[PDB]
Amino acid sequence: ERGWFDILDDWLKRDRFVFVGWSGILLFPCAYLALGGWLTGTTFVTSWYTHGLASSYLEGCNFLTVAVSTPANSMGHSLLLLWGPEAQGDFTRWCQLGGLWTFIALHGAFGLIGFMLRQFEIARLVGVRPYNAIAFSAPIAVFVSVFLIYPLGQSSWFFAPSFGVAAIFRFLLFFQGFHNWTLNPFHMMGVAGVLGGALLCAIHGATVENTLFQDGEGASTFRAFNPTQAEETYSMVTANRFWSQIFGIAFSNKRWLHFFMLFVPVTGLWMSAIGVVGLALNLRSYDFISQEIRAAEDPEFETFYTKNLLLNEGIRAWMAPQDQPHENFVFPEEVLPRGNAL
Amino acid sequence: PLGISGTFNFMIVFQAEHNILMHPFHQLGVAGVFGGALFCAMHGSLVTSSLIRETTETESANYGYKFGQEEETYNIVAAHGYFGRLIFQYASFNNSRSLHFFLAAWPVVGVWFAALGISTMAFNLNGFNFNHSVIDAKGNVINTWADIINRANLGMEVMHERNAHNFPLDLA
Amino acid sequence: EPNPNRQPVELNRTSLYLGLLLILVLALLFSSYFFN
Amino acid sequence: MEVNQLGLIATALFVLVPSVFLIILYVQTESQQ
């Protein structure tokens, strides 16, 4: 049977400069639209009606301060379809209501699905194991938990992260002040995975480069390698002795080493995703009850835990009125928490 | 401080007094460790994807490599053939030496910049200040996300070391 | 009537060390939250 | 300090049950030929 399906399959899988595949029918439009929406929004679109903020190059913002901002809190979790009941097909209103945000987030989610399908698709054609796709589940868990589950637990998309450099910094600081997210052991594990991943990347790269075999005569050692050679290009035996004597332990199985390098950052990101699922419901690691009971009763008891809560209280009271304009917070000067003099 | 919550205290106060999040050396540092962790999983997944079959399904594939063996344990050509098609051919390494050099250099250079950010904000050359940078025709301040960061930074500043300042400027 | 699907199980010494380190470190991390 | 007193047995079983699992598997591996 060589029908139209099989002929289409032939054309989609041609060896061209940019492989396409069946997965490319999903991947390429959704990735292109999400990227084009971000560039369109950061260049031309305001956040004045949703946030009270300028947020585009048109308005005078720079690369650090432009964003595609979340919709107004009053939209709830509306899909904000262009043809939906809020914008009613009006492209200009849609932009002013925050429609580009769900546009980017949703085309982005389906784009990410498409990229992972592409990793599966290409791996099956070339004949390799699909561990690259498996490792990409960690970026997907992060994106889904932070940009979708988290606002879906909250009151509206408004509290999702906005797509911009400084807008994401605000998201970090909001999470410290309101959620005490540095205290959360699921974030801690994520930090370990990311910093441990960066560590493993540096140390393995440096170990290889400094246990190379002399396989050429030039002082530039890059040339003395051939993709199809059978031999290892560096000494696993010398690398093992070096670390065993510097650090006490060393890798001795090269297959374990590279599996571990997949495992560490991927597990870290997955752990951080779980904690953000908790924050969707405000299920925080905010306090240690034992510390608060002691400190309530003993005004000489002070730890770095209680010091950081005072900082969180400053963050909340000083940023909330501007950061949550729909709440209409009016905090007279006399209620604002402040230390002496400052 | 030499502690876990003490570390967090240090970071929060650092943000209030230097706006480290808006400093490009901290931003290069983030690229360093985010990039390093990305390339870590990247390298690990590609090498693991192209391990040469040396074992049965009831045993760990790790027994297919023997410490000190002369021959490589995975097919870098098959890995390059996969990753080259994932992006495009010339975005993929086929030289193991320059690949591993890139793995070394990217997080190391990024962390150098992170260290230099702390070291130069030590002398109070602080992150970008765009507070009230956008002004309308009459002269009203138009807030940006930078101004929202400033509100958060002010809350950190007015509360930190709440009993330690007698005069209005926290100059150190 | 011996079942033909049985298979021996292994855990080598390095895996034991790795596993014990993970469990002790996880306990060291989570214990404070258990005591609260 | 008024800690949760179940924290003690929670931590102890958290260490012991999985550690014991690993020790059983390891020891019966050494005893094979």
Partner: peptide
């Protein structure tokens, strides 16, 4: 009770370091 628990766990880890370094499986070349 909680102090004893934290120090006990910490002490086990330092013990584990000792055995992992000095009573490791030796790497053997082939």
């Amino acid at each position: 009770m909680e102090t004893i628990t934290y120090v006990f766990i910490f002490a086990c880890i330092i013990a584990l370091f000792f055995f992992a370094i000095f009573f490791r499986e030796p790497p053997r070349i082939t």
